[PDB]
Every structure is written in C-alpha cells, then in structure tokens.
C-alpha cells in the first residue's frame, strides 16, 4: 500500500488552497472538478491525489489554523486579537501594593504612597 | 499417618526451608522446632537429566510431592524460610525459588510468615576462582 503523499502532492494542495479557498468545499468530487479547472495537472492520477489532499486540508482548516496556509479570512481574526482583547478598558492598574526592602529602594528614589508591608517567613526557601 | 488430635478449624503449622541454588533445589519440611523432619524432596529426584535439576518445572514437581505427603499427616499451614547459596557466593535465589513457592499455595497448603534466610558473612574468606576470575 503505502499511501504517503509525495511532496509534489503536498505543495500543489497547499498553493491551491491559498489562492482558491472559497471554491474548495468539503466533498471530493466537486474539488476534483475545481482543481481540474484552476491548475494544469498533466495526468488523471495526479489530479485525483491532489484533489484528495485538498479535502483533508479543508476538513482540517474548518478547525484552527494550519501552519502552511495563510488564508485571508483567517488572518483578520488574529489581527483583531492583536489590535485589542475583550478583557479590559482600564489598564491593569497602577493601584498595586508591595512589601519591604522596596520601601527603602524608593526611599532613595523618593516615593511616598500606595503601598503595604509584610516581613516574610524568617528563613530562605525550604 | 496419624497426626495431632485436632483437625477441624485450626492449622497445624510447620516450616519449609526452600533451598534454591543453581544446579539444584531442595524442598524440605520440618516441625515447628526445626529439629525433627518430615518428607524432603529435591529437584534432582523428579527429573532425569542433570541440566534440568534446577528448573521451574522440576521445582513445581517437587512442591506438590511434598504437599501431598504433609497433608497426609497433620500439617495444614507452612512457614517459609527461603535460602540462596550464600557464604561468599551468589546470595540470590536460583530459578526454582519463585516456582516452588507458588506451587504449594496452589496445591492446598496455607502460607504463614515468609522470611529470607541465607548465610551472609561479615567479610569472609577468599572466594574460589583466582585473581583473574573464571573467564569464559
């Protein structure tokens, strides 16, 4: 048997999805026609294997993103999550409080407010 | 082969002494004191080729031959004292050890407290073999 697609079958199927993503549905016999229209595959046997990897990749891409294919419609949802996140309109705030040996680090840099104190358990970690 | 005058609930105890060298294995069995002895079977009685005298099958053939004889008298439960060769030697039990021990739990007896006993020296004499060892 074998059935380990060669790198010339796993590179067509990767370019095709990038260029034509909105045609390539999820069944095999329609993809076998779209692929025959868009590119020039000089054989029937090769055309079918390319169109058969396209379907695998399509089923996988209807989940999370795959690391060889950069499609337009799935960039923008990452671009969003980098532009901002649903969590906060405030900063994670300046109103935060700390403990000793830093009050004296500031006493030589001149701060005077919004802090706390607790002298830690009296020997190094255990 | 009479025994004690009680047989109903309690268990008349005994002691095994499984000696399990390479080359051969003995299943003894004695009374609770150790002094007086009962049937003793050794792997080389059960098989007829020297190379087999220590093997799991020769040991399983001996454990039963001792269990049937003990059950014939009074002894229902057994204590176990497991022996390797010891004395500046292998001090790890041979191939019959595990095999004879399971073969009398299965053939009727009841196992008591099991212990390891093998002579271990506090720096013994010089071991046979030569300074360059027994090379193969």
């Amino acid at each position: 048997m074998g059935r380990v697609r060669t790198k010339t079958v796993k590179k067509a199927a990767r370019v095709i999805i990038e260029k034509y993503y909105t045609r390539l549905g999820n069944d095999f016999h329609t993809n076998k026609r779209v692929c025959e229209e868009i590119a020039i595959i000089p054989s029937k046997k090769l055309r079918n294997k390319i169109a058969g990897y396209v379907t695998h990749l399509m089923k996988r891409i209807q989940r999370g993103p795959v690391r060889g294919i950069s499609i337009k419609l799935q960039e923008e949802e990452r671009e969003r999550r980098d532009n901002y996140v649903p969590e906060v309109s405030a900063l994670d705030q300046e109103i935060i409080e700390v403990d000793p040996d830093t009050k004296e680090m500031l006493k030589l840099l001149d701060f005077g407010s919004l802090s706390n104190l607790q002298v830690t358990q009296p020997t190094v970690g255990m | 082969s009479l025994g004690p005058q009680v047989a109903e609930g309690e268990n008349v105890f005994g002691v095994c002494h499984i000696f399990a060298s390479f080359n051969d294995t003995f299943v003894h069995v004695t009374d609770l004191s150790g002094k007086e002895t009962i049937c003793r079977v050794t792997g080389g009685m059960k098989v007829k080729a020297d190379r087999d005298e220590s093997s799991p099958y020769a040991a399983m053939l001996a454990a039963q031959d001792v269990a049937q004889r003990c059950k014939e008298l009074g002894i229902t439960a057994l204590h176990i004292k497991l022996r390797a060769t010891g004395g500046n030697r292998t001090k790890t039990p041979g191939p019959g050890a595990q095999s004879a021990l399971r073969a009398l739990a299965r053939s009727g007896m009841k196992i008591g407290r099991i212990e390891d006993v093998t002579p271990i020296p506090s720096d013994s004499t010089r071991r046979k073999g030569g300074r360059r060892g027994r090379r193969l």
Binding site: - | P56, Y57, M60, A103, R106
Partner: protein, 64 residues
Amino acid sequence: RVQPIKLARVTKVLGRTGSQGQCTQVRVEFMDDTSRSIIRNVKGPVREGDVLTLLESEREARRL
C-alpha cells in the same frame, strides 16, 4: 501425576516471540473463574477470543 484439562479464552496478544518469531505470546482467562489469568506461548495463528486448551494450567512460560 493426573490433572484434568482446562479451557482458556484468549484476551490479548502480546507479541511474536521465539527465535524465528514462530510462537506467539498471549494472555488467557480460564472460563470457570474469569478472575484467573496467565501468559502462555501458542504455536498456531491465534486471533483473539478463541478457546485454547491447556494440559497443565500450572506452568507460566516466560520466553522463547
């Protein structure tokens, strides 16, 4: 020196041991007390689930 036959059912196939890889390691039940279990070495082509026949259930073979 007299033991009845026992019938075991194969529950799992482990690997193909032996020097030419001829015999097969297998784990069996016992069909009267399904609690028991041993590892045996068979000679033909075992599948899974079929009833072997043991002439001495006490052994337990451990290699080739």
